[model samples]
Target: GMSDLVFYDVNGFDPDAGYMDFCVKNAESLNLAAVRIFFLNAAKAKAALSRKPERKANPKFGEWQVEVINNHFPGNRNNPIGNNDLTIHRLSGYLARWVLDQYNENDDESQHELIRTTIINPIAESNGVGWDSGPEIYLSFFPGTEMFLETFKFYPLTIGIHRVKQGMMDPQYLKKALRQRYGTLTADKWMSQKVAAIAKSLKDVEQLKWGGGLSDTAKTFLQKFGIRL
Candidate 1:
């Protein structure tokens, strides 16, 4: 028998606020094994959208989004990409490899058996919205996570720009919301500081590890990627 573990970040997508409803309602019907929750900040999510400048309106950012039916073989399924489920599985697999390397060994079949799943939730609703971390930092983590995903057998799951727009999580809108949410400074400055803070946090954590981000070597290894204080 397999047990499930759920992790929800307080930044956004409040599980207490019913964000998990979307997954709970569909997991069994979708044949999902387990689900992990990652709540993201609304303001930061919006800033991430602004960074793209071109790509927008992803379904993942939508109020509620779900990924289903992952197929390993590329050509075995009717769809070469194997639909959204396959895409997410690929992404999640890479993340697992990067974050949990020692656990992903071939000697132990349990490595693959320890199936991991995640659900990302954003707090805000509406286009052009923003949050505490900012989009730049979110984008930076993208590279690290992508590297891990590529190295692993499973694919990672993520929403798209369409979802952001659907959720109305745009940068401009987020600025105004932040001003109201924080009640400290203007939206632009607040966003700048927030993004910088996120980058600083990542950098500070990286500094604890050998080589830090000074060389590509560290990024290449899973052990180096998981440096924490």
Candidate 2:
């Protein structure tokens, strides 16, 4: 079912190469019919960058600042996904994971949810940057599918740009590193702990009303964002 749904999203810009042609050449081998590319419309990206002004205080800011600004360069902004010839490799990577999990033979609920939740990172992952220090780079959900789904609607902006582009580990490398660090036994224990933690966290927020109606102040903020709530 998931594979049937073609996914596309705006990706950051690329320079120094024919990224579109690069993707086209690889698409057939990867079984992808389309790819996404950023049209350089980083209005949202810019807004997001400014929202976290405190990040500028960090020493790493200078190095990251250039990468961040470069992503929003004028030429790449406002590019339409449909019109682009190159499929955004990052988005395609995420879709492949979703499809893999959707067709997984096990059918375990937690496993299914894990795949869904984990897909978020890959979508946001840099085109091919960050070989390590990021999330494990899997496509799986745990026991928090509902909460994970709400994340998109509630915070519909990127939050892992740095991690995606230049984190300590890339997805492929992360998987290998994890395998070496934990192997099967360690992974099982770690996952068990994580699942329990997530369940407890879910319990803590079970009663928090997220949508529907809002207080006057809340309504004002929502209106500012063009939300009807």
Candidate 3:
């Protein structure tokens, strides 16, 4: 039952206008499995998280959800590597892993379960991320993103839907639309060769049990590469 989440964020808005209330209403009515949001301003992030919606009808798909994460990367503030080469490699890993559906534990898990990984607009969509939480220092990451996608994986097909503000969100409609759209996968033979090449390349990188990005499952996957958690 892994689902496609509408990646959400509200940047730089003070909590005064009741924007969140309306926004959650939109997702809730749309029955998004979870309410997704990230904050740029620490003060705003603090305020938004403090206000929680109480709807505990079902755990993952029945009714209730409240979720938030501040857009900060603690030790490594840049989620998209600023260095172009590293960004390229990161994108490669991301596309390769995603198309492989690496996060799912079971083969039966929905292949389309992955999140969109970025807000709708790919360029200048910072909408401030990258470079130690500085304001407007995020454009370079967008260019890097486009280049990577253009090179390898084609962007996932965008589903057409009416804008949120027209204001009649329906849970059943969204769930059905998603059910119609996901689970089925579409890819290219080029993708197959690229994945094989990339996976082949990474397969030989030395495996280390004690290092960054090494979960037990991650270690197991790397070992599959002929390569640790």
Candidate 4:
């Protein structure tokens, strides 16, 4: 809400309209007049996204920018899934639509191995960040219930929670508070610059940040300065 950093993991024609409906409404609830929040992804530049988002907003909330940055992980769609080095993260296995071997044309099912789990599945609970991937999804140990589970390892880092404050886990708190304030998170930050408006500014005092021009103690403390975009 008040914080900024936003990431989007796209896997081709993602028509998760329900998720996006919430996205815009959430932005609307905040004080965003023309949300310039950038979306970073690792998707390819191939075909159209099946159905492009056609949310009919009054040019205010219907704003977006997609930047393809391959900095999160090394593996990509270009790599053959069979190769030992090709990092098929658990996300891949869970969301895979078709049979493994059925990927390429004119191929039989036997040609490709099943999407099996790693040797060890690290502990994790369903933390519903994007979606819940918890202990119930994983099968038990070797020589027991099953050795080869049809999923990848669930790293503890995915679910681990530190003592610090939390939100969407996109460094919004750290980036906004320290970077802008202490001088991005604690030392200090969006909505200050009336992005779309020419001169007038829209204010949502209760929502706190994004617009309304730094009147609250938090916004005033971070910035007593002024600038235009």
Error of 2 at 123 (Å): 11
List, residue by residue over 34-90, the lDDT tens digit for candidate 3: 222211122343343234232111122124332322222243333332221222223
How many angstroms is residue 187 displaced in model 4 relative to the true structure, after the best TM-score fit? 29
Better of 3 and 4 by lDDT: 3
Model 2 per-residue lDDT tens digits across residues 1-229: 1223443463423211222433344433332112111112223344454445332211111112111222233454554543223222323333333244343647777855554443333322333312122222222211111112221211111122222334533545333212211111243564464455434434323322312334799888889898885
How should the candidates be ordered by TM-score, best one leading?
Answer: 1, 2, 3, 4
**TM value for model 1:** 0.21
RMSD of each: 17.0, 20.5, 21.3, 25.3
> What are the per-model numbers of colliding residue pairs?
40, 26, 1, 16
User: Which wins on TM-score, candidate 3 or candidate 4?
Assistant: 3
Please rank every candidate by lDDT, starting with the best: 2, 1, 3, 4
True-structure lDDT of candidate 4: 0.23
Q: Which ranges in model 2 have alpha carbons more than 4 Å from their true place? A: 1-28, 31-73, 83-99, 102-229
Q: Which ten residues in a row have the lowest lDDT in candidate 2?
A: 149-158
Better of 1 and 4 by TM-score: 1
lDDT of 1 by residue, 1-229 (tens): 0113455453322112231343345434332122222133333444444444332233242343444332323333343332123234233333322334333335365543442223221221122222122322222233123222112111111222222435634545322123321122334654565555434443432332111123455545655668532
When 2 and 3 are scored with TM-score, the better candidate is 2
